[PDB]
Design a protein around this ligand. Structure first.
Ligand SMILES: Nc1ncnc2c1ncn2[C@@H]1O[C@H](COP(=O)(O)OP(=O)(O)O)[C@@H](O)[C@H]1O
Length: 175
C-alpha cells in the first residue's frame, strides 16, 4: 500500500448494531486499519470523569482526537464508535450509520447482560435514530449512508458494497 492515497471510513450507530463485526471484516479484506474507539480509549486510558446515571467512565474526546489525528491524516483507517459529533469533519471520506430493527437489537443487547436501565437507554437511542441524526448534523448529507444490519446476508452485502466503494475511491484518488 506504499504511496497509495487511502480513504478513511466511519462506522457509527447504536451499540449492538454490528459496527465491530463489519469493521473487522472490512480491515481483513482491504488491509485498511481498523480502530475501535472504545478499545483505544481503554488501551491508552483516555478517560476523564465518571457518569453517575449510566455507570461508566467518560470518554476524553479531545485526547481521543489527539491520539488518532496523525494516523487519520495518513489515511486508510476504519473508525468504529457510537458517537461522531466530536471527530474533525475532515477525517472521513464516507460515513456509514448501521441500523438494526429494534426487536433484533434488543435481543443482541439483552444477551450482553445489560441491565434494564442500560437496555432502555440503548434501545431508545436506536428508536429515536440518535446516531443517524448526529451523523447527518456532523457530516455532509451526500457522504452519510444508512446500512441495514439485521441479518448475516446484510453483513455480507455491507462488506461487498464498502469494499467496492474503497476500490473506486482508490482509483479516483490515485490517477
Ligand atoms: N448483520 C448482522 N446479522 C446478524 N448478526 C449480526 C450482524 N452484525 C452484527 N451481528 C451480531 O450482533 C452482535 C453485535 O455486533 P457488534 O459488531 O459487537 O456491534 P457493535 O460493534 O455495533 O456494538 C454480535 O453478536 C454480532 O455477531
Amino acid at each position: 500500500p506504499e504511496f497509495m492515497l487511502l480513504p478513511n471510513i466511519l462506522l457509527t450507530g447504536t451499540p449492538g448494531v454490528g459496527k465491530t463485526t463489519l469493521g473487522k471484516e472490512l480491515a481483513s479484506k482491504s488491509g485498511l486499519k481498523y480502530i475501535n474507539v472504545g478499545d483505544l480509549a481503554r488501551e491508552e486510558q483516555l478517560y476523564d470523569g465518571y457518569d453517575e446515571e449510566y455507570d461508566c467512565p467518560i470518554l476524553d474526546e479531545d485526547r481521543v482526537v489527539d491520539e488518532l489525528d496523525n494516523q487519520m491524516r495518513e489515511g486508510g483507517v476504519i473508525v468504529d464508535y457510537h458517537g461522531c459529533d466530536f471527530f474533525p469533519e475532515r477525517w472521513f471520506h464516507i460515513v456509514f450509520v448501521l441500523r438494526t430493527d429494534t426487536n433484533v437489537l434488543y435481543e443482541r443487547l439483552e444477551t450482553r447482560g445489560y441491565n434494564e436501565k442500560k437496555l432502555t437507554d440503548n434501545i431508545q437511542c436506536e428508536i429515536f435514530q440518535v446516531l443517524y441524526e448526529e451523523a447527518t448534523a456532523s457530516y455532509k448529507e451526500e457522504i452519510v449512508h444508512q446500512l441495514p444490519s439485521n441479518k448475516p446476508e446484510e453483513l455480507e452485502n455491507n462488506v461487498d458494497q464498502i469494499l467496492k466503494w474503497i476500490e473506486q475511491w482508490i482509483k479516483d484518488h490515485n490517477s
